[PDB]
Amino acid sequence: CMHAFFKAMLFMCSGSIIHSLNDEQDIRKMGGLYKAMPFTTTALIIGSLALTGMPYLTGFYSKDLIIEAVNMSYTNAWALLMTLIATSLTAAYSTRIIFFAFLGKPRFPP
Amino acid sequence: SGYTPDEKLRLQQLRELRRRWLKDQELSPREPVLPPRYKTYRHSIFAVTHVLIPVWIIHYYLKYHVTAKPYTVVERKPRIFPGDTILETGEVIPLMKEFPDQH
Amino acid sequence: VHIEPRYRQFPQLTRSQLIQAEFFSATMWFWILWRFWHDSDAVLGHFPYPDPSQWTDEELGILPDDE
Amino acid sequence: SFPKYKPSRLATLPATLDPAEYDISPETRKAQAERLAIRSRLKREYLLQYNDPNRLGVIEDPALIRWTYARSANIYPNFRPTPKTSLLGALFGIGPLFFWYYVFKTDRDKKEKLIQEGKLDQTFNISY
Amino acid sequence: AFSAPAAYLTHQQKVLRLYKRALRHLESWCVHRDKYRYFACLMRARFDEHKNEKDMVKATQLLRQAEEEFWYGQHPQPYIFPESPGGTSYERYECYKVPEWCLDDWHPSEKAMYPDYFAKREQWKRLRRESWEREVKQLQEETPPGGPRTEALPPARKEGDLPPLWWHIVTRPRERPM
Amino acid sequence: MGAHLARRYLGDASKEPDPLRMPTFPPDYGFPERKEREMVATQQEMNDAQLMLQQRDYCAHYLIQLLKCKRDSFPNFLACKHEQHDWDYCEHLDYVKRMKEFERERRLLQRKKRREQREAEMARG
Amino acid sequence: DAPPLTLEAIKDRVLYVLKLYDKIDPEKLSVNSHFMKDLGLDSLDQVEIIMAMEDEFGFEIPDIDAEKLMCPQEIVDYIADKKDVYE
Amino acid sequence: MNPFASLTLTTLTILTIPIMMSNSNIYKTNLYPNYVKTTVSYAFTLSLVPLLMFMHTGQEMIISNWHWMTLQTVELSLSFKMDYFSVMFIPVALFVTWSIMEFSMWYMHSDPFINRFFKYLLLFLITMMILVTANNLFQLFIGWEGVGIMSFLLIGWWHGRTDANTAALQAILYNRIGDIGFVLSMAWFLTHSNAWDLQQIFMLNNECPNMPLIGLLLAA
Amino acid sequence: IMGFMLALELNNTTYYLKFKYPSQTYKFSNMLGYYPSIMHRLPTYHNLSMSQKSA
Amino acid sequence: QQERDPWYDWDHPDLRLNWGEPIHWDLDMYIRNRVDTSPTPVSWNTMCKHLF
Amino acid sequence: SKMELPDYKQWKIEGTPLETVQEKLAARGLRDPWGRNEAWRYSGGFANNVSFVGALLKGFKWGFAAFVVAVGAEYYLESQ
């Protein structure tokens, strides 16, 4: 349920960016959208925070409990390690989207 | 390296024809000649039809046809807790024993 | 509202969208702070974790080695 | 220097890395010219028929006709029983049948042995 | 696309195509504009360094080594314009492209809904029918006896003619048809 | 995760406890008089409350009280904080008792190792 | 959605890019100037000019076609033809 | 009768309604996207109601309304499982679909077949609801393959794009290997338990074996 | 937070006027682990080849 | 056909074929919707080794 | 309607990373002629942009003020 919420919102913000930039889907050609597009910027930031498990957003009440249960169970050691690394990589690619789409100077056509 | 004179001339002529063709593709003020033959009100007609008629039909179907045969609608029995009042028989489910309470 | 296209310039923005974005970012941060003020146990835990080293052999029912 | 690229059948060699692209002979140039002339002749024929204002229908493609004929109706006349053909046919047409026969025969023999010995869980198996 | 290809690519053409491809992939690696400008100037410096070279054997060997270097260092996921062959918007509007021969099968009522358009269309059809013989005659007069040696087509040499084989080029569907 | 895993794997698995076989010592071994655990909720009460089979542990009475609280104050979904805390505290006490069982098993195992080493040395000497 | 292109708009944008090119003198640049016959550039300069136009208008000109555009007017005509611009 | 069954079935039915109207002047007009969006909004509210009913007393039901066919000792009927999972996932899915339909009304504004796009979105929603509320394996499989084929149709939305067509067929291929696993599970359950419905499956499988559970895992 | 910090450092490194050829790990990650390439060219090719040459 | 040039004015733009030219025996499996043999940035052997 | 292109003389690389690039190239003995055509991106409303941490804290200032006011009101109500 929680993932339905914030992932749908993230895809809608991505689509808004695509439409405003003439069907461009490359973060290498996005840029400056933090100030260019205020509402989609704040929506995508809130969604990416909720995705990564901000302490009291919609993703905290599921992902945090899942990680707690995985750590506290009689589990596969390799599965536990891969789960933790995947949480780190989730934060990583959310950072990549934000950094390459919204921060910096523009790269889109004039 | 560049256009030959024949390539340049043919491109010029073809582009002139193409522009003329698109200009002809433009429509006329009269062109789509069709043959002869409040916000709350719209959602009020929508709500009665789309919500009211189906709910009437479905409630009639369930109350008088589906639930007229055994085991068609099975409900999970309600939870009963200590110190409860069973409404069916006016019964009283007793409370639990005293907890060994801490702090 | 009609937004005129810009060429090599920052696009025209709207007061409504600026205030809406600011209000919702502020709403998220207020919610996070308000939840942390009240429900801080969800992040930092609620009950202490016992140290098994401090449990006496008498209370764990371990007899002296010689016995 | 840089690691070399090894072409495969499913990842072919790029044209820019082909050694023959940088060793061009005067006969290579005339081969290219002849190929371009063939393409130009075919293109002229197709374009004339294509832009004909009076043509209605399908421009028949002899290449397509030959391809469909070679794929179906010309195979048996040009087939000969060779050792390779016989072995490949025997394998691909007989090996799978006997492999599956052995698999199913063994499985059903085990099932029937368990049934006869009366130690196979057949409870609730009403529908057969 | 619009231009007929030749039998082979010259050495200069190969060098320029490598230059453009290398700059595009360098831009894909160097996401930011300042970094791209810096490294693009360095790349042009390398090309200008080898610009003057009389030994064509050495020039071809340089091109071959440059191609190997490019293949090793190319971006696995280079930037592609949306409408370009690898792009995301490539061939999206092909299902919306319908031909004018499909247009002329309309019912009379449908055609009656657009009286002015179809008069101009009839004028275009008459213009096409009145020129076909001159077009074929011009094509068969100017060809060599062996046949067409290339895919290029001539223009109209006279004041009343049209460039031979022009109908589908001129009346091709629009890039955004619907 | 924890240091017990390192001790068992990169160390003396004979001295460390085995979770899938614990306990291996009698419950009264070293306990002169040991009292059994008390169960407040009865089988019929848990069956009526329709507790999940993994929720029918020794803390089930606080869970039943929490469920009854949440049902009665439905629209106010923030009115059973005390019942939630009572259930959580009972679960915490149960967990620390499990931890005590593990630690008892560990030091009993190492006491047995020491005793058998002492017997082996006495026999050798 | 997006405003349609016009011949004047395309011409303005191409001349704008060319005036922002440093190797072209903006005073003697016209819509009929040849990149090499009367501006003194070379093949690499023309390649960079075409790439700049590709970035400007957001589409790609294939190498077979781009090697022939030796004039801002030729570039304008090519882009108008490709974008179906007639006005 | 309690309003639980009536309101759940009403949500499903009013979802199906605009597909019936896909052969009318409204489907020929430009009000069809807004019509479908309004329908999804109303269905979302009517689904919110039984969620409140469950959140109070934890009420769950199964509705075997229509009997389809009796294969000797196996009875197939149209049954719906309105439990915690269904009554929680339906409002979430409807809320998300409502927002997505509005965003598509803005986003697909220039699409010549926006009405067909909205009809396809509503058909996917219907199949997903069938999947979620299904009480037997056969109805669950109907929803399974329905969402698979709607995904196929919507991925290849632009038919002139070869990449779109390859992507659609690829999705079909992988989901079809999943369906191999699903059908293995269905055959095992019928053969060894004489049932395709979750009640009898759960009652009779005190310890489920590797073969059916691995079939389910492969399908998932 | 460690993922945030490491990703941010790596992304800030992109501004430097330093160019380096990609790594094997980068190629593996960017090309999807080579799974679509190998497993969309090899088994499909063999199945479509058997479907004609043999059957 | 994926390896065939995309910028050329083919008679069949989607199939990337010209009218009258010989058709490969396995065109049915070498269409752009099917098996692709285009060159890849990494060698096929390296791909296999890394994946396995 | 009918937008006007801003005058091209206004685009300069001074006070821009492009002039740092130009200085490095000049030290190396080179020049880049496309400086201004890129220099449009570094001026005007694109001149200053936030950092990654400053982006995450977009509404923290007003959110914290509202939080302090609400905590004060709650404490006031609890006291009286």
Ligand SMILES: CCCCCCCCCCCCCCCCCC(=O)OC[C@H](COP(=O)([O-])OCC(O)COP(=O)([O-])OC[C@@H](COC(=O)CCCCCCCCCCCCCCCCC)OC(=O)CCCCCCCCCCCCCCCCC)OC(=O)CCCCCCCCCCCCCCCCC
């Ligand atoms: C667009 C619609 C169609 C869509 C499908 C289209 C494609 C298929 C077409 C059909 C193909 C097959 C053809 C078969 C022909 C034979 C027909 C037949 O056998 O019909 C069977 C059957 C008839 O059975 P029967 O044996 O004849 O009668 C048994 C009883 O005696 C009956 O009990 P009774 O005596 O009480 O009778 C009640 C009575 C009266 O009903 C009522 O009273 C009910 C309504 C009560 C309303 C209450 C409120 C009233 C208003 C208020 C009044 C007071 C004032 C208050 C004011 C308040 C103001 C605020 O109504 C009827 O009798 C109606 C019977 C059915 C009539 C229609 C039959 C049409 C056949 C046409 C065939 C044509 C050829 C087809 C093929 C052509 C080629 C394609 O009819 C139906 O099944 C009809 C529908 C049943 C009810 C609705 C069920 C809802 C289920 C919901 C499930 C949701 C699932 C969602 C899943 C997806 C989302 C997840």
Ligand SMILES: CCCCCCCCCCCCCCCCCC(=O)OC[C@H](COP(=O)([O-])OCC(O)COP(=O)([O-])OC[C@@H](COC(=O)CCCCCCCCCCCCCCCCC)OC(=O)CCCCCCCCCCCCCCCCC)OC(=O)CCCCCCCCCCCCCCCCC
């Ligand atoms: C067969 C092996 C199977 C292994 C299975 C298990 C796999 C586990 C994977 C773990 C994560 C690996 C992440 C890197 C892989 C992708 C690299 C890449 O291409 O990035 C470009 C990509 C950017 O793409 P781009 O902008 O296009 O860049 C293109 C450039 O050309 C730049 O391109 P580039 O290629 O030049 O940049 C890569 C370069 C620079 O990137 C990095 O160094 C990435 C960051 C590595 C961080 C490692 C941990 C550092 C410490 C973290 C904190 C924990 C320590 C304690 C701290 C205090 C705690 C109280 O790194 C390397 O080349 C070294 C190798 C990287 C890691 C390899 C892992 C093993 C697989 C390969 C084995 C063989 C490798 C041989 C060497 C390569 C071939 C010659 O990077 C990112 O977006 C950042 C991702 C990396 C950071 C994410 C956050 C941390 C990740 C988890 C670390 C652990 C956290 C705690 C977990 C829970 C513990 C309980």
Ligand SMILES: CCCCCCCC/C=C\CCCCCCCC(=O)OC[C@H](COP(=O)(O)OCCN)OC(=O)CCCCCCC/C=C/CCCCCCCC
């Ligand atoms: C159980 C039944 C058999 C299962 C294994 C079947 C393997 C072979 C499948 C049939 C071969 C396909 C025949 C012809 C299909 C057409 C091929 C085709 O269309 O091309 C590939 C097409 C598109 O190519 P693109 O890469 O997207 O091109 C991009 C364009 N630039 O994509 C595909 O269809 C690839 C399909 C390859 C199948 C291989 C996958 C097999 C994986 C099985 C692993 C199972 C593990 C599951 C875990 C279970 C846990 C208990």
Ligand SMILES: CCCCCCCC/C=C\CCCCCCCC(=O)O[C@H](COC(=O)CCCCCCC/C=C/CCCCCCCC)COP(=O)(O)OCCN
């Ligand atoms: C793991 C998959 C195995 C499939 C089934 C197992 C059967 C064995 C595998 C194939 C062996 C032969 C089966 C039929 C194949 C025919 C051979 C063939 O196609 O080539 C014939 C050669 O055959 C002959 O004419 C002589 C007949 C026997 C030679 C080939 C069979 C030898 C097989 C070796 C036996 C096994 C070796 C054991 C090694 C250890 C294995 C555990 C013609 O030669 P060419 O003109 O070059 O045409 C090929 C074009 N590239």
Ligand SMILES: *P(=O)(O)OCC(C)(C)[C@H](O)C(=O)NCCC(=O)NCCSC(=O)CCCCCCCCCCCCC
């Ligand atoms: P214009 O007609 O003036 O063009 C002049 C040319 C170049 C045609 C000359 O007249 C000419 O033919 N000169 C001699 C031939 C020649 O130039 N040979 C050398 C050309 S290749 C060269 O040496 C440059 C290669 C260096 C760059 C390699 C690119 C690889 C990097 C790719 C990286 C991709 C991701 C970063």
